[PDB]
C-alpha cells in the first residue's frame, strides 16, 4: 500500500462532486467540464464520485471505463491508475469496471443527459515490434593472404569473383560461398565470420550453409538471379595484405586528463585487445563501407559516452563517408564480430583453452576417509515398533500351509505348531475398533526350499488381491518375528518342528527321541524349536524337553525364566506326556542314557546367571565392503544366518565381548574391530569393568560360551 505523489492527484476527492480523467500515453489528463458525460470509443477513462455523508465522513467510488476500440496500454493504464488512486486514498473506495454498451445502471445514473459516444481518440503509446524479427540482406567479401578481412559489397552476381570467399546474409539463413581459386586462410576466416554472425548477432537463431560452384541452393539463385560466368580471380599477393592492414583507425575518448581529448590509438590493424581500456570510450572507424563502432567501457563517465557518440557522428561529414554509414554502439562483452576481426586473437571470457574437459553430468562416490566412532552404537537407539498392531492378538485367524503347488488349511487344533522346512500363510482379522483391517503374514522356514517360498509369495499376493487389496502384507522369516505375530497364539509358545512336506517325499515321519529347546525374550514371547538330541546340545540358560518312547524329561537350567518353564510344560501337554522335572546338577542316569552321552554341554558363568532380561546380549556386524568401515546392529535374536562369513562379528554379553571372524575376513577388519570393541567398552553409559576381556573366535572353532547364546546351533551349517 505504498502511496504515490502524482501532482494531479492532489486535487482529487477534496470536495463533493464528480471528476473525470482520460488516459493519454501512460498519463492522466482531466477532461474539461463541458465535455462531461460523453466519451471517446477508443480511449480509457477514470471516473470518480465522492459523496458527503450525514456523520461527516466522505465516501468515494471509482469506476474505470473501457471502450470497444481502446488498445491494451490504455486499458491497462486505466486499471493501474485506478489502483494507485485507491492507494493514494486510505483504501476507502470501491472500484468498478465499465464496458462500453454494457454499463451498470448506477453508471447511467451519474450522468443527467445520458451517454453518447464518438469515434476516434488519442493514439496508443505502444510502438509495434514483433518478437525475434530480423530483416537483413547483406553480402560480404572475405579476402586476403595473411591479413584476411571482410568488406561489405553490394548484393549482385557481378560483385562475385572466383578468387575470394563470400558470405550472403539473409536473416535466418546464411550462405557461405567458397571460390575454386580461394585459399585456406580466407576459407577459415569465412567460416569464423559466418559462425560469429550466427552465434553473436542472431544468438543462434540462424542456420549456416556452405556452398561452392555448381552446388548453389535455390535461395541464392532466387535472391541473386541466374548465374553468369565468373571473372576468375587474381592470385593472392602481399599488396592487399598491406591494403587490409590500412583499413581501420582506433581512437580514444577520455576525460582522464581533465579535459576533452580525442586521440589516435592506432592506425594499423591487427589491434591489441588490451588496448581497449575499460575506463574510456573507443571508436573504430571502418567507414569505407560505412561502419563506425563506438565501444563503451564499464567504468566510463556519461559525458565520455555522449562525446564518443558526438565524435562518431562528426566523422560522417568530415571525411565524406557515404550516406548509409551505421554507427553501432557496443558495450563491453557485447561486441559485434565485424568489430572483432581487426584485433589480434580476440578472447571471449569463457573460452576453452586447449582440448578442454567434459562435464559428464553424473559423478561416482568420493567419500572422505573418516574414522568411525563406536559411541554412536549404544547411544541413539531409535526404534519404530508397530503402527497398527495394537491388539493383543486373540482375533480370528486362518493358517494355510503350502504343499507342492497348492495351499491347504492346517488343523485348527494346531495353530502355533510349524514345520521348519515348510511355508505358511496366516490371515488375521482385526476385531479392534480401529476401522477393523486385515493382516497377511507370510512365514518362511529356514529349511524350506525355493519352490515353497516362491509359491508362498505368489499365493500371498493372490490372496491379497482377491480380498480387494484391503489387507497389508508382512514377509517374515524364522527367528525374525514381530511381537504381534508371537501374540497371535494367546500366550502359547511357537513350536518349530524339524522336517516337513516335499513334492517327492511327502510328510516326514518324526523321530523316536526328540529334543526341544525353549527360549523366551525380555518381553515374554517364547519359542520352542526341535534340535538334534545329543548331550552336548544342552544350554544351561534354557529349558529343554526330551521325548523318548519310554518316558519324558523336562530339564531346567539355572538361567531359565518362568516363561520358559510354562512354555516347556505347555509343550509337554502338546506332546501328551508326563515329565519328571529334572533339574541341573541332579540329573538321573536314565536321562543321560536317553541322550546317549555323559557331559560336556554348553556352560559359562554368564549363562549360569539368572539376571539377563535387564541386559540382553547384543550382536554387531563389522564390515568395510563399502570402503568405509561400519558397525551395524542386527535386530532380532541370534541364529546362523546373522553370522556373516565375509564380515567380522561382535557379541556383547556384559562380561566378555566375543570377536568372531570368518574364513575370508580381512585382517584390518579384525584389528580395527578390536579397537572399536574396546572403545565400545569404555564409552557405555552404565560404567562397567575396563578390563572386560576381548576373546578372538575363529570360524569352525567356537567355545561353548559363544555357542550357548544362539538358538539352535548347527555344527555342519557352513561345511558343505
Amino acid at each position: 500500500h505504498m502511496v504515490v505523489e502524482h501532482p494531479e492527484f492532489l486535487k482529487a476527492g477534496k470536495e463533493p462532486g464528480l471528476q473525470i480523467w482520460r488516459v493519454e500515453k501512460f498519463d492522466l489528463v482531466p477532461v474539461p467540464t463541458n465535455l462531461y458525460g460523453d466519451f471517446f470509443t477508443g480511449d480509457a477513462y477514470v471516473i470518480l464520485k465522492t459523496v458527503q455523508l450525514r456523520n461527516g465522513n466522505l465516501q468515494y467510488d471509482l469506476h474505470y471505463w473501457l471502450g470497444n476500440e481502446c488498445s491494451q496500454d490504455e486499458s491497462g493504464a486505466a486499471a493501474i491508475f485506478t489502483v494507485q488512486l485507491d492507494d493514494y486514498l486510505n483504501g476507502r473506495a470501491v472500484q468498478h469496471r465499465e464496458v462500453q454498451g454494457f454499463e451498470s445502471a448506477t453508471f447511467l445514473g451519474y450522468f443527467k443527459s445520458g451517454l453518447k459516444y464518438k469515434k476516434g481518440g488519442v493514439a496508443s503509446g505502444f510502438k509495434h515490434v514483433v518478437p525475434n524479427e530480423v530483416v537483413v540482406q547483406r553480402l560480404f567479401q572475405v579476402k586476403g593472404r595473411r591479413v584476411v578481412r571482410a568488406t561489405e559489397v553490394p548484393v549482385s552476381w557481378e560483385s562475385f569473383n572466383n578468387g575470394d570467399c563470400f558470405i550472403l546474409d539473409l536473416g535466418n539463413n546464411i550462405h557461405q560461398w567458397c571460390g575454386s581459386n580461394s585459399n585456406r586462410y580466407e576459407r577459415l576466416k569465412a567460416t569464423q565470420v559466418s559462425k560469429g554472425i550466427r552465434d553473436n548477432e542472431r544468438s543462434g537463431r540462424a542456420r549456416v550453409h556452405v556452398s561452392e560452384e555448381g552446388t548453389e541452393p535455390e535461395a541464392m539463385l532466387q535472391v541473386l538471379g541466374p548465374k553468369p560466368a565468373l571473372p576468375a580471380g587474381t592470385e593472392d599477393t602481399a599488396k592487399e595484405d598491406a591494403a587490409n592492414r590500412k583499413l581501420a583507425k582506433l581512437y580514444k575518448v577520455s576525460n582522464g586528463a581533465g579535459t576533452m581529448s580525442v586521440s589516435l590509438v592506432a592506425d594499423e590493424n591487427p589491434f591489441a585487445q588490451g588496448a581497449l581500456k575499460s575506463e574510456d570510450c573507443f571508436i573504430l572507424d571502418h567507414g569505407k563501407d560505412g561502419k563506425i563502432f563506438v565501444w563503451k567501457g564499464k567504468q566510463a563517465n556519461t559525458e565520455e559516452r555522449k562525446a564518443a557518440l558526438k565524435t562518431a557522428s562528426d566523422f560522417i561529414t568530415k571525411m565524406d563517408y557515404p550516406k548509409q554509414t551505421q554507427v553501432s554502439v557496443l558495450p563491453e562483452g557485447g561486441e559485434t564480430p565485424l568489430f572483432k576481426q581487426f584485433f589480434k586473437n580476440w578472447r571471449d571470457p569463457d573460452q576453452t583453452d586447449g582440448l578442454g574437459l567434459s562435464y559428464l553430468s553424473s559423478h561416482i562416490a568420493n567419500v572422505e576417509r573418516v574414522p568411525f566412532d563406536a559411541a554412536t552404537l549404544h547411544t541413539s537407539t531409535a526404534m519404530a515398533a508397530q503402527h497398527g498392531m495394537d491388539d493383543d492378538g486373540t482375533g480370528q485367524k486362518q493358517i494355510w500351509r503350502i504343499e507342492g503347488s497348492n495351499k491347504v488349511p492346517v488343523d485348527p487344533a494346531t495353530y502355533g505348531q510349524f514345520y521348519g522346512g515348510d511355508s505358511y500363510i496366516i490371515l488375521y482379522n482385526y476385531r479392534h475398533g480401529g476401522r477393523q483391517g486385515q493382516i497377511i503374514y507370510n512365514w518362511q522356514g529356514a529349511q524350506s526350499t525355493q519352490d515353497e517360498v516362491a509359491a508362498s509369495a505368489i499365493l500371498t499376493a493372490q490372496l491379497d488381491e482377491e480380498l480387494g487389496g484391503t489387507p497389508v502384507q508382512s514377509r517374515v522369516v524364522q527367528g525374525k518375528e514381530p511381537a504381534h505375530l508371537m501374540s497371535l497364539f494367546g500366550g502359547k509358545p511357537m513350536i518349530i518342528y524339524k522336517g516337513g512336506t516335499s513334492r517327492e517325499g511327502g510328510q516326514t515321519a518324526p523321530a523316536s527321541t526328540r529334543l526341544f529347546q525353549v527360549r523366551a525374550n525380555s518381553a515374554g514371547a517364547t519359542r520352542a524349536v526341535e534340535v538334534l538330541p545329543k548331550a552336548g546340545a544342552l544350554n544351561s540358560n534354557d529349558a529343554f524337553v526330551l521325548k523318548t518312547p519310554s518316558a519324558a524329561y523336562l530339564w531346567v537350567g539355572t538361567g531359565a525364566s518362568e516363561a520358559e518353564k510354562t512354555g516347556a510344560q505347555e509343550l509337554l501337554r502338546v506332546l501328551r506326556a508326563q515329565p519328571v522335572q529334572v533339574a541341573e546338577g541332579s540329573e538321573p542316569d536314565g536321562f543321560w542314557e536317553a541322550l546317549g552321552g555323559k557331559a560336556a554341554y554348553r556352560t559359562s558363568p554368564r549363562l549360569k546367571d539368572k539376571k539377563m532380561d535387564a541386559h540382553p546380549p547384543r550382536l554387531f556386524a563389522c564390515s568395510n565392503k563399502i570402503g568405509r568401515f561400519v558397525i551395524e546392529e542386527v535386530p532380532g535374536e541370534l541364529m546362523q544366518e546373522d553370522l556373516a562369513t565375509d564380515d567380522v562379528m561382535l557379541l556383547d554379553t556384559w562380561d566378555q565381548v566375543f570377536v568372531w571372524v570368518g574364513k575370508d575376513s580381512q585382517e584390518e577388519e579384525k584389528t580395527e574391530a578390536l579397537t572399536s570393541a574396546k572403545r565400545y567398552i569404555e564409552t557405555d553409559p552404565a560404567n562397567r569393568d575396563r578390563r572386560t576381556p576381548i576373546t578372538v573366535v575363529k570360524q569352525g572353532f567356537e567355545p561353548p560360551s559363544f555357542v550357548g547364546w544362539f538358538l539352535g546351533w548347527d555344527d555342519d551349517y557352513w561345511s558343505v
Binding site: 559428464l360 561416482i364 525355493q450
Partner: protein
C-alpha cells in the same frame, strides 16, 4: 495333467523348460547363423540356416544375427525359427497340447504383445498362453513381494519397484546399456593393446573374455593407479587358435560403463542413480523397505564386486538413517525362469490363461486386457 512350458526369451539367451522344475532344460543363445562362403563339396549336410548351439559350433564360417536388438524384436522370421528350434529340437515336444508362458520386459512397445500372440495361436496352435513381467518373476523367485528389481541382461537394464506384488508404472526406468554394449566396448578398448576383433565370431570370443576375466573395482581411480604402478592385475587368455593375449586395466574398465555411461558416450546416468531416482519417485512411507529389499537379476549382474560397489554408491546417495541391503542370490541368472516355473505350476493359475476361445472371439487384443 498337461505340463505347461516356460520359455524366457531374452536378448542374448533362451531359457526354456517345463513348469514345476527347478532348472531350465534348454539354455542356448538366440542367434541365427547363415553361411557366407562358397560350398564346394556336394551332398554332405549343408543347410541354409543354423540356430542355437549348432551355429556356435560352426561360427567360423557363419555370419551370426541376433533377432532381438535392445529388447525389441527386429526380425520375426528368425524369431519364429528360434521358437521352432526350442519347441521341436530342444524340448522335443509338440506345442499344440501345452500352454506356454512367455516373458516380456516392461515399457516395451505394444505392437510386440499382440504379435507374440499372433504367432503362438496361428502357427504353433497353443491351447493357452500368458505374458508376464520379468521383474515380478525375479522378485517372486526370491520369496519376496515388495522390493526393487534391477534386471540387467544382454539387451536392456531396467529398474522396477514392486509394491504388494504389482509394479508401479510411474517409477519403472529403462537404460539401454547391457551386456552387448559392454562386449562392444571391450572390442573397442582391446585395440589399445594391439588386438583386432571385428568379426561376429570374434564378438563371441570377446563376450567369452568378458565373462571369464572381468570384475567391478571398488574404487576406480585407486584401482587405475594400482594397475599403472605394477602388473599384479594382469591376466592371460588363450584364443582358440592358440594365441595368448594379456589384459590389465581393461578387466575393470569394461564393467565401469555400468556406473559411468559416458565411456560409450551417453548423457544418461549410471545404474545407481537410476535405482535412487526410481526409489525417489515412490511414496514416502514405502521407501524404507525398498532400500532394504534390493534384489538383482540377470546375467550382467554376475561380475565380482558388483554388489559391494552398488551398496557403496547407493549408501552415498541415500540418507544415512536408511538401511541398505543389496541382495544377490547365486541363481540370479535363471531367476526369471524359476519365478515363471513356480507361477505356471499352481493349481490356482488355470483361469488367468488366455485360451483359444476368447482369443478368436476377441482378436489380437485380449493380451492387453488379461495380461496386466
Amino acid at each position: 495333467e498337461t505340463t505347461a512350458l516356460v520359455c524366457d526369451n531374452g536378448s542374448g539367451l533362451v531359457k526354456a523348460g517345463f513348469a514345476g522344475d527347478d532348472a531350465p532344460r534348454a539354455v542356448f543363445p538366440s542367434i541365427v547363423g547363415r553361411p557366407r562362403h562358397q560350398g564346394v563339396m556336394v551332398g554332405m549336410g549343408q543347410k541354409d540356416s543354423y540356430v542355437g548351439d549348432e551355429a556356435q559350433s560352426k561360427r567360423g564360417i557363419l555370419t551370426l544375427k541376433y533377432p532381438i536388438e535392445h529388447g525389441i524384436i527386429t526380425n520375426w522370421d528368425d524369431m519364429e525359427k528360434i521358437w521352432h528350434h526350442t519347441f521341436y529340437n530342444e524340448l522335443r515336444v509338440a506345442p499344440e497340447e501345452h500352454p506356454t508362458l512367455l516373458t516380456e520386459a516392461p515399457l516395451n512397445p505394444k505392437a510386440n504383445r499382440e504379435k507374440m500372440t499372433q504367432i503362438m495361436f496361428e502357427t504353433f496352435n497353443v491351447p493357452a498362453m500368458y505374458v508376464a513381467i520379468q521383474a515380478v518373476l525375479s522378485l517372486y523367485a526370491s520369496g519376496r513381494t515388495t522390493g526393487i528389481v534391477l534386471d540387467s541382461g544382454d539387451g536392456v537394464t531396467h529398474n522396477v519397484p514392486i509394491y504388494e506384488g504389482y509394479a508401479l508404472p510411474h517409477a519403472i526406468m529403462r537404460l539401454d546399456l547391457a551386456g552387448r554394449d559392454l562386449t562392444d566396448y571391450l572390442m573397442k578398448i582391446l585395440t589399445e593393446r594391439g588386438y583386432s576383433f571385428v568379426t561376429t565370431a570374434e564378438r563371441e570370443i570377446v563376450r567369452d573374455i568378458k565373462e571369464k576375466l572381468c570384475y567391478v573395482a571398488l574404487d576406480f581411480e585407486n584401482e587405475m593407479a594400482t594397475a599403472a604402478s605394477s602388473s599384479s592385475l594382469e591376466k592371460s587368455y588363450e584364443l582358440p587358435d592358440g594365441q595368448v593375449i594379456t589384459i590389465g586395466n581393461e578387466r575393470f574398465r569394461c564393467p565401469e560403463t555400468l556406473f559411468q555411461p559416458s565411456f560409450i558416450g551417453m548423457e544418461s546416468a549410471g545404474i545407481h542413480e537410476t535405482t535412487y531416482n526410481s526409489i525417489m519417485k515412490c511414496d514416502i512411507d514405502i521407501r524404507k523397505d525398498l532400500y532394504a529389499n534390493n534384489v538383482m537379476s540377470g546375467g550382467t549382474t554376475m561380475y565380482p564386486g558388483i554388489a559391494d560397489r552398488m551398496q557403496k554408491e547407493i549408501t552415498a546417495l541415500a540418507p544415512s538413517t536408511m538401511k541398505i541391503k543389496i541382495i544377490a542370490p547365486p541363481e540370479r541368472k535363471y531367476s526369471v525362469w524359476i519365478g515363471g516355473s513356480i507361477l505356471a505350476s499352481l493349481s490356482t493359475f488355470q483361469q488367468m490363461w488366455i485360451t483359444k476361445q476368447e482369443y478368436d472371439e476377441a482378436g489380437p487384443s485380449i493380451v492387453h486386457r488379461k495380461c496386466f
